[PDB]
Paper text:
Replication in eukaryotes utilizes CMG helicase (Cdc45−Mcm2-7−GINS), leading and lagging strand DNA polymerases (Pol) ε and δ, Pol α-primase, PCNA clamps, the RFC clamp loader, and numerous accessory factors of less defined function. Ctf4 (Chromosome Transmission Fidelity 4) is a homo-trimer (Ctf43) that connects Pol α-primase and CMG helicase. The structures of the C-half of Ctf4 and its human orthologue AND1 reveal a disc-shaped constitutive trimer via the β-propeller domains on the N-terminal face (N-face) with the three C-terminal helical domains interacting with up to three CIP peptides on the C-face. We sought to address these questions by a combination of biochemistry and cryo-EM and found that one Ctf43 binds CMG very tight, not dynamic, and can bind 1, 2, or 3 CMG holoenzymes without steric hinderance at a 120° angle to one another.
To investigate the structural basis underlying the strength of the CMG–Ctf43 complexes, we determined the structure of the 1CMG–Ctf43 complex by cryo-EM to 3.9 Å resolution. In agreement with previous structural studies of CMG, the C-tier AAA+ ring of Mcm2-7 is highly dynamic. By excluding this region in 3D refinement, we improved the 3D map of 1CMG–Ctf43 to 3.8 Å resolution. Based on the density features, as well as previously reported separate structures of Ctf43 and CMG, we built an atomic model. The overall architecture reveals an extensive interface between the helicase and Ctf43, amounting to 1706 Å2 of buried area, larger than the stable contact between Cdc45 and Mcm2-7 (1182 Å2) and between GINS and Mcm2-7 (1583 Å2), explaining the stability of the CMG–Ctf43 complex. The two major interfaces are between the β-propeller region of Ctf4 and both the Cdc45 subunit of CMG and the Psf2 subunit in the GINS complex of CMG; these interfaces were previously uncharacterized. The interactions between Cdc45 and the Ctf4 propeller are largely electrostatic, involving several salt bridges and hydrogen bonds. Furthermore, a loop connecting strands β1 and β2 of Psf2, disordered in the CMG structure in the absence of Ctf43, inserts into two blades of the β-propeller and becomes ordered by forming multiple interactions. The interface between Psf2 and Ctf4 involves H-bonds between Psf2 residues Arg34 and Lys36 with Ctf4 residues Asn850 and Tyr848, respectively, as well as hydrophobic interaction among Ctf4 residues Phe518, Leu770, and Pro771 and Psf2 residues Ile27, Phe28, and Pro29. The previously-identified interaction between Ctf4 and the CIP peptide in the Sld5 subunit of the GINS complex is actually a minor interaction site in which the N-terminal residues 3–15 of Sld5 form a short helix that bundles with the helical domain of Ctf4, primarily via a hydrophobic interface. Therefore the Psf2 and Cdc45 extensive interfaces explain the stable association between Ctf4 and CMG.
Residue numbers in the entry:
A (entry chain 5): 24 to 103, 130 to 198, 201 to 211, 235 to 305, 319 to 339
B (entry chain 3): 17 to 57, 91 to 141, 151 to 310, 314 to 331
C (entry chain 7): 1 to 31, 59 to 158, 189 to 216, 220 to 386
Amino acid sequence: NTEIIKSFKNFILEFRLDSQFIYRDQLRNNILVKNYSLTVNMEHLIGYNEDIYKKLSDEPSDIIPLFETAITQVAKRISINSLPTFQLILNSNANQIPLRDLDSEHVSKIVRLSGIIISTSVLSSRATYLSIMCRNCRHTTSITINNFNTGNTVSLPRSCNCGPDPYIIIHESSKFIDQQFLKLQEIPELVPVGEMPRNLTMTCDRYLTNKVIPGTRVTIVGIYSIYNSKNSGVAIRTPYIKILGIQSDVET
Amino acid sequence: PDAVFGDRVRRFQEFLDTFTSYRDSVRSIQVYNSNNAANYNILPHRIIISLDDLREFDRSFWSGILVEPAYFIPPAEKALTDLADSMDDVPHHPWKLSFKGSFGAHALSPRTLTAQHLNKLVSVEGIVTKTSLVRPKLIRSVHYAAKTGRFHYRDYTDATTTLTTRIPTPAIYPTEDTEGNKLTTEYGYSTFIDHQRITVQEMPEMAPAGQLPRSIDVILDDDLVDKTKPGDRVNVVGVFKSLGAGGMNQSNLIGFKTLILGNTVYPLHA
Amino acid sequence: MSAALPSIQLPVDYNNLFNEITDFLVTFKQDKGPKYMAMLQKVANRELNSVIIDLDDILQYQNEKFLQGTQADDLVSAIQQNANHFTELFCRAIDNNMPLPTKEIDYKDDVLDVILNQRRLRNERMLSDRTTELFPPNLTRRYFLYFKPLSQNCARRYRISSKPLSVRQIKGDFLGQLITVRGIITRVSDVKPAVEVIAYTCDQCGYEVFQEVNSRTFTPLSECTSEECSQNQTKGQLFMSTRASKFSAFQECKIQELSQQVPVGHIPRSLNIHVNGTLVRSLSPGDIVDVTGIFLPAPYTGFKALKAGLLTETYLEAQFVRQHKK
């Protein structure tokens, strides 16, 4: 929350291999083309410091939206008006977890896996920064959501008494992003001799949409998270993988 | 209202002399509304404005429309009607715009949308695919009491208004003024407009490799009802509004449906 | 009131246009006695109950005092904008200028003839032994009113509401006028007893309360509010009776296109039609008819789901039908 930005803000400025340093040359060449992202190799985090990756491996849902605001304070040291929140795309290679053995222990942990993509969906809209006004008080405000944990985790407040939820979203001043909703099937060479091949459903953020055609072999690095819609049991949730960084092969 | 409307209406009064040919065509609409009354005792109120003098009058207003149209069209709306009164004073009602356009860099086919093209003037094309039915829609309601004389009034507008958003009025039935009265809803004197939603998808010839088509649905109102048959090649101009709540109001996945509030639906033959 | 529900003034006034209705009644000389004397009295003699007022007589009566004598405002063009407020008010002129005791008060030519007298005489028995609420005026009518348009020669002389419009030509702006259409009647339902006024009975205080009826929705009352029972702890339980109220006939149908006015493109459409009054069972499916009548939208129905475009349902009341293949 505090000062973990500065422990990451020094990582982008000062990481350096033998002669030419990478994350101030990958951040500059992705602004002139107007690409607005960054690609962190995850082996270079733990070579520079181990205490940073200790926080990121334990509780990733609350720290990656802190690194996204640690980039957009550095891109104002290079460009000098509209610079949005940057997106963090990461990739690594530790050990593949097969799709069959995903226990109840891997809830909110960085997990990579593999498989074949069955289907896609149509794009959508999620809100990032919206503007609210009350109906009676007409007291304007601005809620900026940046975290992503699909239904509702951050909603409207109840007072600025007035009525039950007096708040209106104003559609004339906001910003929006995209979502994609894939599906992923395990590779048939890890044969289910008495089973059918299972599947999972992922989500994708603004810069990974429309990247992969149905029918390919991918490797996917994401957060194994959970959501509780009723769209069949008591206190039952459902699993899904929030993708942050799809490392496909050569498409061939 | 502010001075933000104040200087904004005034600059659209300088758009009556440099291209005064538009001020000619307002009289021609007032011609056919007199000579039809001369045979009994048809024309809409839509003015085709080329988006071509606006480069030669003010580049800070031409690029204003194609970036935030919910702040420059409703000023230019009321500026047209007061000029559509002071020239024609003999007889005793929106006067909408068109935007012919000289189509800008927002000429995007409906496969590439929804990301940063909210609240702009897109010019979408494709093949119409549903063709829903027509229903009327309430706008104004005039009540009348015959025990104390005078008429009354009630505005009522939905979330699919002209362009903006305001405080939504769920006006079921306005009755019971501050007296003992049984108010009466005068039909005929009230106003009703037509409403029709059609969905358009991308063309199969300019499609990529084998996938599903992606469609987008456009609302037409006040003039373009029963204009195109299903299965036609249609070019449309509108504003990429996005209404609805994304499940944040119902305290509980997907959300935020998108629409286009069309103006010019212009059939093509190529 | 101010700043909410304001007052927009209109060029059309309604104050003076009651008196020229009264002079279109039995004080009439264009058609021994006038046509509105005996036809009113024949209905008052309980021989008819469907008073068919024509509209061409309004036009010819206008020319009798147009440029001749005094100056008066137009009424046929006043009907062709409102067409519904001139239905409950055109009857309001009739009941004053109509003799009731002309016929015998004899035995049953229609039911509720003896009980309505007991309804009427008990109400004056209520207002006798006291030293002031009577029956509502829309209850005691016992006729109907209709209108017929004009097409042949009267418009060609000096210049409407009789053009055979197709079903697809009906815009959204005709909501509140008189129209004439044509087509093929299909899916016609039967006759079902509706209700337009309702009589309760308190059974303890005797005071029968009433209310008015609007389409497809009405709410029953609370317990009794009459001043004999109330202002105490003992209030009577009221109960509805069917032998004390007014019912009417009701029907429904759907008119498609005549398949000559169809385009080569779009697929034919339909309008809903309610037939209210004594013209019931006068239609039959699978023919070619020409229906007239006022055209008004259906109000708000509940559950708030498909609403705020109001689900107007665009139905069409009937006034007069003109068949083909007689």
